Paper text:
Among type II receptors, TGFβR2 and AMHR2 only interact functionally with a select number of GFs, whereas ACVR2A, ACVR2B, and BMPR2 are promiscuous and can form signaling and nonsignaling complexes with an overlapping group of over 30 GFs, including homodimeric and heterodimeric activins, inhibins, bone morphogenetic proteins (BMPs), growth and differentiation factors (GDFs), Nodal, and Lefty. At the most basic level, TGF-β pathways are activated when a dimeric GF forms a signaling complex with both receptor types, triggering a phosphorylation cascade from receptors to R-SMADs that results in R-SMAD–mediated transcriptional responses. Structural and biochemical studies have revealed that the GF-binding domain (GBD) of both type I and type II receptors adopt a similar, “three-finger toxin fold”, where the “fingers” refer to three pairs of antiparallel β-strands that form an extended β-sheet. We have solved the crystal structures of the type II BMPR2 GBD in complex with activin B and of the type II activin Receptor ACVR2A in complex with activin A. We show that BMPR2 and activin type II receptors interact with GFs using a nearly identical mode of binding.
To identify molecular differences in GF recognition, we solved the structure of ACVR2A-GBD in complex with activin A and compared how the two receptors interact with these homologous GFs. For the ACVR2A complex, we used previous crystal structures as search models. The asymmetric unit of the BMPR2 complex comprised three receptor and three GF protomers, where all biological dimers were related by crystallographic symmetry. The asymmetric unit of the ACVR2A complex contained four receptor and four GF protomers, where all biological dimers were related by noncrystallographic symmetry (NCS). One significant difference between the two complexes is the relative orientation of GF protomers within a GF dimer. These differences can be attributed to flexibility of the activin dimer interface, which leads activin A to adopt a closed conformation and activin B an extended conformation. In addition, the different ACVR2A structures were completely superimposable, indicating that the conformational flexibility of the ACVR2A GBD is limited. Thus, BMPR2 has three extended loops linking strands β1–β2, β4–β5, and β5–β6 (blue circles), whereas ACVR2A has one extended loop linking strands β2–β3 (green circle). Notably, the GF-binding spectrum of ACVR2A was more stratified, with activin A, activin B, and GDF11 forming extremely stable complexes. However, the faster dissociation rate of activins A and B from BMPR2 indicated that activin–BMPR2 complexes are less stable than activin ACVR2A complexes, providing a rationale for the preferential utilization of ACVR2A by activins.
Residue numbers in the entry:
A (entry chain A): 27 to 120
B (entry chain B): 311 to 356, 361 to 426
Write the structure that this text describes.
């Protein structure tokens, strides 16, 4: 009963699916996550990838998918919860 | 297996963090910036884990029954269980790639 939004901007080159819902599989007693990585050129957001993410503490106890790093070239996002990567936000931690 | 708690130099899993910034890998690794790789350390006196493999179990069964040369072999702290881990890095053609790389984090340490 765990799944994440799947999106691959490189679907053509990789010859894989472009969208869909990816089921998250992980070892017992190990958490599961969703991830989102995009670009933010002057406000126009361009998603790069979205899908399941393996057990990562950095993603623990986060129902919101937020990027807290300061102005990265490629924004990353990870979170806990079904479709938690459905939406993402930017809130740098200073 | 066991986690290292000092004093006792038995085979235990010592925690260890790898910072991609340190080894100069953050230029091609978007996420994460680092991770807990860990390693194994500790002397092994007379397979000394908690949940081994079929092969280690069969040979261990020959060891605990006196059948040599197993009683003439070294025993050393080595990783027994290894965990995969997700990474978002750059391809050789500067393409953003996400993979579930295997044998990334040492979870259990045992004696060979
Ligand atoms: C990929 O897309 C095809 C066509 O929609 C579908 O049949 C298949 O199950 C999908 N696979 C995954 C892993 O999403
Ligand atoms: C980056 O995207 C977020 C929404 O996810 C937005 O709030 C922010 O303004 C964007 N960055 C810039 C520089 O516009």
């Amino acid at each position: 009963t765990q799944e994440c939004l799947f999106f691959n901007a490189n679907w053509e080159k990789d010859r894989t699916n472009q969208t869909g819902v990816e089921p998250c599989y992980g070892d017992k007693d190990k958490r599961r996550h969703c991830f989102a990585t995009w670009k933010n050129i002057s406000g126009s957001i361009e998603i790069v990838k979205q899908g399941c993410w393996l057990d990562d503490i950095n993603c623990y106890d986060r129902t919101d998918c937020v990027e807290k790093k300061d102005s990265p070239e490629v924004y990353f996002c990870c979170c806990e919860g079904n479709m938690c990567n459905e939406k993402f936000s930017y809130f740098p931690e200073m | 297996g066991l986690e290292c708690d000092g004093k006792v130099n038995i085979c235990c899993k010592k925690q260890f963090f790898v910072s991609f910034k340190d080894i100069g890998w953050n230029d091609w690794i978007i996420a994460p910036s680092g991770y807990h790789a860990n390693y194994c350390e500790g002397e092994c006196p007379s397979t000394s884990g908690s949940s081994l493999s079929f092969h280690s179990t069969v040979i261990n069964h020959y060891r605990m029954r006196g059948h040599s040369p197993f009683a003439n072999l070294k025993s050393c702290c080595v990783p027994t269980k290894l965990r995969p881990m997700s990474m978002l890095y750059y391809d050789d053609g500067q393409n953003i790639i996400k993979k579930d790389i295997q044998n990334m984090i040492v979870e259990e340490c045992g004696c060979s």
